Enzyme design. Structure first.
Site, PDB file in Angstrom:
ATOM      1  CE1 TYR A  60      -1.115  -5.217   2.154  1.00 53.81           C
ATOM      2  CE2 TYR A  60      -0.710  -3.728   0.338  1.00 53.81           C
ATOM      3  CZ  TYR A  60      -0.252  -4.636   1.255  1.00 53.81           C
ATOM      4  OH  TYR A  60       1.090  -4.974   1.236  1.00 53.81           O
ATOM      5  CB  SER A 107       4.023  -5.121   1.132  1.00 49.87           C
ATOM      6  OG  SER A 107       3.772  -3.815   0.595  1.00 49.87           O
TER       7      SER A 107
END
Ligand SMILES: [Cl-]
Ligand SMILES: [Zn+2]
EC number: 3.5.2.6
Length: 358
Positions: A147, A61
């Protein structure tokens, strides 16, 4: 490197490697704007291939920071606005729940509960439309941060549509090439596979597998040298000669939402410096980092604050990465490992190093 850097790095990272059983690791410490490099262990255990400054690691990420900056570059070109509706770029999303969901929401995980992962069954373009058309939000947009790859991943794919370029071509032409990140890849070419480290999960060598919106959310591989240059670029945007990319970097460090002491950028996350170390360490634990949390809007977004701790964690099955930097101090760190080990250990090690050098 200066003695103080060598000492703190040995005393912090060699024990981390001992404690976490990391097979291979690369670290760059950016001090007074200059990178100093360190490597340990093996990129490929069975072949006994050492980690070098040319070893490619899966960023997981941390890829989102590239996506956020590419989006910022598109904003500075006037190609998109964060207030634009999602449906402007994907008219086929006719389901009523998408009314009111903007590119801002997608970019900052605030659309109302888009899930952490795009389901693995999504393999086609029509599968992906069906997924988003049938997703039901748990909250009104702009109220809760959750998220999610399915959020920022879609942001990236739509942000490049005005350019007519694929996401990969936009990223290569507009970000990688101008910044001379010449060993950074969404798709590792055959001639570079020799430098692609293996990740290790439960003792088995693994690489990330293809998935929907992977390039946008978690698919970049890079070397410690290119990642040091990425940190330098985000530390010193005014050194970038391409105005839209300079501005895109700045916009990715704007503060769009606040929850607790954390601020959401485009990919990047930020806190005020000096930071409470326990908040960045504890907040990096996935039990917190993946939880839904109320957000307060910042309107207009705060322009990039130089006195910030700016950072991002990343993981794949076999890799664990961390980047943090402090623009005011021209001080940063990149930690790339081929084992996914707990985020709080990464953040603690990074803070011990940067705190020692401030
Ligand atoms: Cl020691
Ligand atoms: Zn020692």
């Amino acid at each position: 490197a200066p003695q103080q850097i060598n000492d703190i790095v040995h005393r912090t990272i060699t024990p981390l490697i001992e404690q976490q059983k990391i097979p291979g690791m690369a670290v760059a410490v950016i001090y007074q704007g200059k990178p100093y490099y360190f490597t340990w262990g093996y990129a490929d255990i069975a072949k006994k291939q050492p980690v070098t400054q040319q070893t490619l690691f899966e960023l997981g990420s941390v890829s989102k920071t590239f996506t956020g900056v590419l989006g910022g570059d598109a904003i500075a070109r006037g190609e998109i606005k964060l207030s634009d509706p999602t449906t402007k770029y994907w008219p086929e999303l006719t389901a009523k729940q998408w009314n009111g969901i903007t590119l801002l929401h997608l970019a900052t995980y605030t659309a109302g509960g888009l899930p952490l992962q795009v389901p693995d069954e999504v393999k086609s373009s029509s599968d992906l439309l069906r997924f988003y058309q049938n997703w039901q939000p748990a909250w009104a947009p702009g109220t809760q941060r959750l998220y999610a790859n399915s959020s920022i991943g879609l942001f990236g794919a739509l942000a490049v549509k005005p350019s007519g370029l694929s996401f990969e071509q936009a990223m290569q032409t507009r970000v990688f090439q101008p910044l001379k990140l010449n060993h950074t890849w969404i798709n590792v070419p055959p001639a570079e596979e020799k430098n692609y480290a293996w990740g290790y999960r439960e003792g088995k060598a693994v690489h990330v597998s293809p998935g929907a919106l992977d390039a946008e959310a978690y698919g970049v591989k890079s070397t410690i040298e290119d990642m040091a240059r990425w940190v330098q670029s985000n530390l010193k945007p005014l050194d970038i000669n391409e105005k839209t990319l300079q501005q895109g970097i700045q916009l990715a460090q704007s503060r769009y939402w606040q929850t607790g002491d954390m601020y959401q950028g485009l990919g990047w996350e930020m806190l005020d410096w000096p930071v409470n170390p326990d908040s960045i360490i504890n907040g990096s634990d996935n039990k917190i980092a993946l939880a839904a949390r109320p957000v307060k809007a910042i309107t207009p977004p705060t322009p990039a604050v130089r006195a910030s701790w700016v950072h991002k964690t990343g993981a794949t099955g076999g890799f664990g990465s961390y980047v943090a930097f402090i623009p005011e101090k021209e001080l940063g760190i990149v930690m790339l490992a081929n084992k996914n080990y707990p985020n709080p250990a990464r953040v603690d090690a990074a803070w011990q190093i940067l705190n020692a050098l401030q």
